[PDB]
Design a binder for this molecule. Structure first.
Ligand SMILES: [Ca+2]
Ligand SMILES: [Ca+2]
Ligand SMILES: [Ca+2]
Ligand SMILES: [Ca+2]
Ligand SMILES: [Ca+2]
Lengths: 376, 376, 376, 376, 376
């Protein structure tokens, strides 16, 4: 993930211009190799046409170039690219939205599962670790970085995500499918055991816990679904064929013919086709957007930081369920204890952001006196 | 379903180009027959125009040619294709999202329905089997592969999904409609019986179970709705008419008129119309995306693996409700029992994925001492 | 509703081509009259121009035709058609999604409302009949077919949906609004009475019942919303003007001018304008999609089968809440009672659909021995 | 709100044609003034060029018109109009969907809040009046018609929406913000008081009531948000500049040059530019769609009937919570008391709508005996 | 935020025209610097070409201008601008929808947390202050204005949002991540303590409180997500490259060549390129829409008033949970106590908005006498 929110906070002079100086996760870094190959092919064809052929062959090549230039269509490639990239971006944001965050569940666990003793600590930590284990299982199934971090369940055990007992239980329960669903059944059974043992005081609290755990399960299932059901290969191949056919016919139809022949559009020999290269940058970058976002769990610069998410989730959830359980700051009257209308101060740098309240669009409507009497 | 997520994990050199060497679910496999028919018709017309005409019918054909090519438009076909295919893809993903997964229900059943004895085993298995039976009923109603697997309720009984008693009950209840809704009423009545018999300890747990079952029912109803209410036949016919009219007028417009006659644009003879063939591939593949995704429950290469989903759901749900009920790994302190800030290790292949936490876009904003002072 | 899902299950040769032979809900049936009018007007103009005027008037008409030829724009009409039809299709699917289905409510009623005696039967049937009565009230308010079936509350009483007592209660409660909301108040009060009388054991069950009834009420309110708040008449008139201004200027600008005058685009006299007729079919069918779908509760071929939905809902709900209450098939161990991994069989026609499980996109990643070692 | 759903129920001959004869909420009524101004300016320019200008000035004006007619493009204005109008329509439908309907809350109040005496009547009426008061407060904040009806809280008190005691309490609570949120806190406190006093029998019923009231609060907050956060002024100005630049360029570029000079585009003088006028109608009406829908709470013909909604909500909610509380029609066996398959009759006008049930797309698949045999 | 809802309430004469006179948040203020730079560069090139070079160099520049003005395509830039700006607007409205509002939670707290004494006041205020503190933490993490107001946790303490005890607890809990999640765990633990101490009477009320808190947590997490996972830099760079390449090739291709050479489109020298400047305004303003909305928490005119939101939330929540707890207006019969059909009056200015109720689109369907008979 490349973040430039601070840079694009305000719509200043050249705000998007200053983003063109970035390298990581950029268009140049994405398509420099393709541009180099295109350059090599274009100039090889140019040299072949210029100083490798006879007069009749050059005339035939010029006829072919004139035939090719008219066959360069921008409406269809733009149309397919726009919708394909829109679909890819929508799926990418949905995939991020299905990343499981254990925050609600950990707050509920810390509140509900009672006991400041070792048994209560074990119960809370085991529940939140079941949640984290399910999350890391689906993440290592769907993300190459997480898989490289934990290439096996033995690696998961050595990293502390799984106990050896849990690993043995998983091996005993092994079926010819992905076993990421097992920790949710473990969580449900452990929560029922906690309620029966008196650690969870009410079945409504049990239901809230299981609802949050079910939401996490649904998010993980959506992640698995997005990993499994790819965008249709026919659609991807169609958009690729459009782009590459465009920039393969351009290789011939954008060649600088001899200016002596006084062609309508080939009166000048600029050597470099700057507009063809600009179109290459634009269209191939538009395609590279979809190329990068089609699997947002790879190792691209703009892919998600799944390893950081895993580490943060583990640390935060463990802290919340263990140290923060029934550990509150002292409850004391606040600064505005007897102030009916509190007014927090503004700094000198933020005094200009103090605004009057918006009371509605109809507030300033002016009505005459007679217009306001109720009619019988 | 054809998966290439691992192939497109990173935006590497020619990442989408390497996808053009596939055959399953590919554009070539989808439109090779149409391309062969187009080839045959095009070259039949070419041979008829040159070796089977006279010097006046030929001259007329040329007149028709330069008329047909001038009456070729791409914006309308691109528009109708883009919008229609976008609608088809949206409906395809919605249809996948409405595929019922019994994971939440099975976790709730395993947790809630108490009893490690034969009666408890039977109750849990029967509830989850009612869920699976409803899912398989709607799936065999809407999916050709599942129907070929289970062409009759007797086949369902022989497959173990339905008991002979359940089959007799369904036959007794037979209405002149699709009877896929019956297992949900069965589940509701059996869950009420379990609660009244003490197997379910609290009506809040009963409500949670029924909420999960009703979510499954809504998903199955949406699947039935998508099977029944097709995309408007008028819209499908409009897009088909656009594409086929384009590629029928191309048959005359894209003919290679003889070089001897004088015509702008037609000055040489390239035999093979490579640009017309590229356009055919692009547009007919764009249409084949919709042709394949319009019913994602057929037997195309990119259609859903409903049979595998059924088998996996049955196995996983039965295991979860029978063998995993109150069967937990031993609860022991984890690796980070007294570690305030756990830090799982990174492998050599993943050490580069260790990232600092993102604390917000405002973190690096610099303010002076006078700027930070609160104003009175 | 016209269904062709079975016909479009697989992407076969000419899959969308075989849909052009349909008559019901087809483009031909939708626009044959407008095509006939366009034909008649076009050939009236053609016959007037060639044999009705003098040479000067003919030359003036040729100049006007050339002027009109350059004012035939496809981009704007395509844009407005695409956006408007997309909106119409979205609203059409939303309207279908807001059609109330009593399945969840009927399962909850059958489970929760106890009593196999006459009073319990009456209570369950009355609750489900209140649901069905509200549904039929909103449906007869919004659908012409349902209104023609039940043109009056007396017709509803004769049909059995409403009792004479309920009819008199409605007449007593009569207000100058649509009274489709009354059955939900009746349902809430009757459910409260049932809970107070002991027929409903727990207020949590009461809450579940009322949540389902409120979901049905929201769906009915959305149906009323879509029936009341139409797509803006200005937008509909704009798209109609865009289509008709195109096909009114085509009448003059697509006339076959005399070939003797040797105009650029009028060398040939083909009599029948095939491209103009194809464009008429394409665009007028695109508009006919919106014309048919703008009110999906009319009597079009592709409109919803609301009468069938009403009949099916009544029958299914009554059966579920009366005959299926506490009436379950015999509970006995299944075929996989002691099978850890059930494997239901495949038929000969479905053996090709047996596939291995998808274990994740990262499953096949190959790592070296040194790469997999945890770093300190 | 202009309704034509009955007119567009079926896709008949000229179904959208017959909508062009409407005046209320129509394109003519929306843009007649703009069309008159554009007409006056166009003909002023034409007369000035024809008469006032000398020969050299006319020659310069002719060159200017020729240079202007090639700077009039439809693609960018079409894009900006389509996307902007789509966003405006989406926001308009969302704004209507956020209009609060008290139906679910009123059913819950009537059911849950017990007591047929004066105290129970007062409690139910006060709760539903708090809901209606919050709704009318946000509506008078966001809607010009509702503000004109109730220009002050004193007007609200005279209209009966607010009790003078409630007015005094609001004045005591007065804060420098919109106080539409106060009745929700009032409702919560009154519901808690009712539960503590025994009028509400169960805290789960209390929770259901508060959940419905909170849904209403969320809808009202969304209405306030839509009123406050307008569509970006930069975007609105961009679309306005596009349209107006188009039709200011057209003023000169569409002038009928003198036919004597014999430019190809201006060979004859039609006087009236019918195509420019049709384009004006199309584009300015497309913009008028967004102009009318940008604030759907104004006083346009297609704007919402917020006053009627307020009146209907008040009447219906008061009736439901006061006269309909525990007032049910007599519970008697229905027409299908012992009928397993109820078949309500059809009328002569609805006989053709009786259809067989759709049993699934796989129903008609034909399989051989050998194909249907299970394999080992 | 710039509001013009009252200005655009009605679709009057030139309603969008009158919005072109605004300055705050306007296209002029957004792109005047870019337009000045474009002006300077264009006229520098013009003055170079006019009198800086020799005749041969001027001829070469003229050929370059002719060959550059033929490579200006509005199609791709329009496509990418439309799609990218639509994505930006969608994300902007989602970011607004994820702004946390404590209204539902404060109503639930005021209702549920009992006690009119000092301890009850402290408990309610502390809970609502935990909610406000979490909101302000995420807002100061994501918003530059809020960060400038509160550049440190000590600033938060001095402002009254945090007590010294809470600051000391946060410092104890300090983790190398954003600590905005801590107040939710604090709220959960404090609510559980309140329920155990008898201040909250029922665990269902506890569950409702925690559900509202978790909804707020989800909103804050979505805000953090939008701050962190920005729009792909490759996509932003692609759209920027498209726009700037267009307006860089325009700098040369839109130059007024010598009229003496009688170029096809350079016959007249108007000095000022009005249409090029209009295109600059249109396209650069369309890009400035996305530039302003890409981070809606900056300090642009159309960016959100997060400081006002914070102040209003604090004041309103404190008032609701402290002063309005169990403080209700006197319950007395209303104006319509014995009126079955209340009819609130209309003012003179609003008497025209009294409309008859809409009874459904099928209301006016007229059927013959014999058409209404039920048939056997
Ligand atoms: Ca990637
Ligand atoms: Ca298919
Ligand atoms: Ca219809
Ligand atoms: Ca309006
Ligand atoms: Ca901004």
């Amino acid at each position: 993930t490349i973040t430039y929110t601070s840079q694009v906070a305000n719509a200043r002079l050249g705000s998007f211009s200053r983003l063109l100086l970035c390298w990581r996760g950029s268009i140049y870094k994405l398509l420099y190799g393709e541009f180099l190959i295109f350059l090599l092919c274009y100039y090889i064809i140019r040299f072949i046409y210029r100083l490798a052929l006879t007069e009749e062959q050059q005339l035939m090549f010029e006829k072919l170039t004139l035939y090719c230039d008219s066959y360069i269509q921008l409406i269809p490639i733009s149309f397919v690219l726009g919708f394909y990239v829109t679909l890819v971006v929508t799926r990418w944001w949905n995939q991020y939205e299905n990343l499981p965050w254990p925050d609600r569940l950990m707050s509920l666990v810390s509140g509900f599962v009672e006991g400041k003793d070792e048994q209560g600590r074990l119960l809370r930590r085991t529940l939140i670790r079941y949640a984290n284990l399910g999350n890391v299982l689906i993440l290592r199934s769907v993300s190459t970085a997480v898989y490289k971090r934990f290439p096996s369940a033995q690696h998961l055990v050595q990293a502390g995500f799984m106990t050896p007992a849990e690993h043995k239980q998983l091996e005993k329960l092994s079926l010819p499918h992905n076993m990421f669903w097992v920790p949710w059944v473990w969580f449900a059974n452990l929560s029922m055991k906690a309620w029966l043992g008196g650690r969870i005081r009410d079945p409504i609290l049990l239901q809230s816990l299981l609802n949050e755990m079910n939401t996490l399960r649904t998010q993980c299932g959506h992640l698995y679904a997005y990993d499994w059901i790819s965008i249709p290969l026919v659609y991807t191949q169609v958009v690729t064929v459009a782009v590459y056919s465009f920039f393969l016919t351009c290789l011939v139809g954008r060649q600088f013919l001899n200016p002596a022949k006084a062609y309508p559009g080939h009166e000048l020999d600029l050597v470099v086709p700057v507009f063809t290269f600009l179109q290459f940058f634009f269209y191939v970058g538009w395609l590279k957007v979809a190329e990068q976002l089609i699997n947002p769990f790879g190792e691209d610069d703009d892919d998600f930081e799944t390893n950081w998410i895993v580490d943060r989730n583990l640390q935060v959830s463990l802290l919340a369920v263990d140290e923060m359980h029934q550990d509150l700051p002292r409850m004391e009257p606040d600064m505005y204890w007897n102030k009916p209308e509190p007014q927090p101060p503004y700094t000198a740098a933020s005094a200009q952001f103090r605004r009057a309240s918006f009371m509605g669009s109809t507030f300033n409507i002016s009505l005459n006196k007679e217009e306001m009497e109720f009619q019988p």
